[PDB]
Design a protein around this ligand. Structure first.
Ligand code: GM2
Ligand code: TWT
Ligand code: D12
Lengths: 100, 276
């Protein structure tokens, strides 16, 4: 029984244009075991309507999941992805960098 | 023909204690999900209007029943023979099974199993092949599993007769969505600066279908070797996302362009230049 930390990628479906509707995504991959808690944050507080794919795994048996939501980006509105897994001591927060 | 050429069902069985076991399943066509599984009701959730393929509502209910009794019986016997196999709680078993079409007409079927994220068993032409990663446990399992003819026969029917009969049904029924060609959209940005006098050149590609795509950083007609390609990340609208980066010096950034080749573009490639 091994333990692998999830790789966390935060990205928008379309390029960030302030005021226009878009989709925010958080893709968690490469983890083992499956048991995981993921949240999408808006300035530090969790978003309510967030859909997620059913559990899946890649060839090497590591698990992957996609968490998304239809958002509207503005100037100072900071977004992030909070992740809780057995490998993490405290929840890991990875910010959304528009230019990345 | 383009798009997905394979069908597979997956299984993730989390065993917490001697009498607590949850199972999660789903049907896929490559990386695209077409089936979901409602564990409580023991029925399939059909994510697309063509998810049934060419199968009848009787043929699909027969299959729902097979998986339902399997999910129960699998969990039941693993909880029964856990101490016999020296298993330490908590543990997770994983399993992928299905078939695929090759160019020429041939359909190869597969079934792979796992324990603790490591290979346990495999199925190469009607027989259990224990993986060395499973050790003595895997051998002890394959040697036991062959004695139950009733379950070995129903795996053989499913894998070598029902699976290909299914694959063609869905590949055909879903021709409209599966062999669709959605055009990519591209944009540039300057990522986090690696060196104090350097610059991270980022090329973004998104909104495309099918999966095969070519993206490189160019200098006219000469491609850069230091072009680090990102992972092919998904979007829930059955489209993809790809990043292509280049670590470069300040003055060298000018003259550089990103090139995107995709099957929906039809020769008309997307070339985007860096503006000084
Ligand atoms: C559209 C779908 C296409 C996709 C096809 C690909 C998917 C393939 C799925 C395979 C699983 C699919 C595994 C097979 C499904 C299990 C159901 C079954 O045939 N078993 C009956 C056995 O008795 C059954 O009773 C029924 C009712 O009286 C009769 O109708 C059946 O003919 C009779 O076999 C009972 O034993 C209840 C089941 C409990 C047994 C636990 C099985 C766990 C171990 C199986 C591990 C498999 C690996 C072994 C290696 C083989 C070489
Ligand atoms: C068209 C029919 C609709 C049904 C599809 C719904 C998805 C079913 C989910 C169940 C998946 C179970 C099969 C997995 C393969 C066997 C794994 C082997 C276990 C290894 C033992 C150590
Ligand atoms: C790893 C735990 C061993 C599981 C043993 C499977 C036995 C199958 C019995 C089928 C009932 C008829």
């Amino acid at each position: 029984m091994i333990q692998r930390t999830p790789k966390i990628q935060v990205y928008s479906r379309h390029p960030a244009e302030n005021g226009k509707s878009n989709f925010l995504n958080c893709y968690v991959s490469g983890f083992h075991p499956s048991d995981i808690e993921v949240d999408l944050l808006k300035n530090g507080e969790r978003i309510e309507k967030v859909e997620h794919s059913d559990l899946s795994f890649s060839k090497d048996w590591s698990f992957y999941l996609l968490y998304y939501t239809e958002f509207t980006p503005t100037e100072k509105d900071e977004y992030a992805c909070r992740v809780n897994h057995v490998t993490l001591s405290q929840p890991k927060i990875v910010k959304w960098d528009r230019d990345m | 023909f383009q798009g997905p050429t394979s069908f597979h069902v997956i299984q993730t069985s989390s065993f917490t204690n001697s009498t607590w076991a949850q199972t999660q399943g789903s049907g896929w066509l490559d990386d695209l999900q077409i089936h979901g599984w409602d564990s409580d009701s023991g029925t399939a959730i059909f994510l697309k209007p063509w998810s049934k393929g060419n199968f009848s509502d009787k043929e699909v209910a027969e299959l729902e029943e097979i998986f339902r009794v399997y999910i129960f019986g699998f969990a039941r016997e693993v909880q029964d023979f856990a101490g016999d196999f020296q298993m330490k709680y908590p543990f997770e078993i994983q399993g992928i099974a299905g078939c695929e079409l090759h160019s020429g007409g041939a359909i190869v079927s597969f079934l792979r199993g796992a324990l603790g994220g490591l290979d346990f068993l495999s199925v190469k032409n009607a027989s259990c092949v224990p993986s060395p990663e499973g050790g003595s446990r895997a051998q002890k399992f394959c040697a036991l599993i062959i004695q139950y003819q009733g379950i070995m026969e129903t795996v053989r029917i499913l894998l070598y007769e029902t699976c290909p009969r299914y694959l063609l049904g869905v590949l055909n029924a879903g021709k409209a969505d599966l062999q669709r060609q959605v055009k990519p959209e591209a944009w540039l940005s300057s990522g986090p600066s690696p060196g104090p006098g350097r610059l991270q050149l980022v090329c973004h590609v998104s909104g495309f279908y099918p999966k095969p795509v070519w993206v490189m950083w160019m200098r006219g007609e000469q491609e850069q070797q230091g072009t680090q390609l990102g992972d092919i990340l998904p979007n829930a609208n059955w489209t993809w996302y790809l990043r292509a980066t280049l670590d470069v010096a300040d003055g060298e950034a000018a003259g550089l362009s990103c090139r995107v080749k995709h099957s929906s573009l039809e020769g008309q490639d997307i070339i985007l230049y860096w503006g000084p």
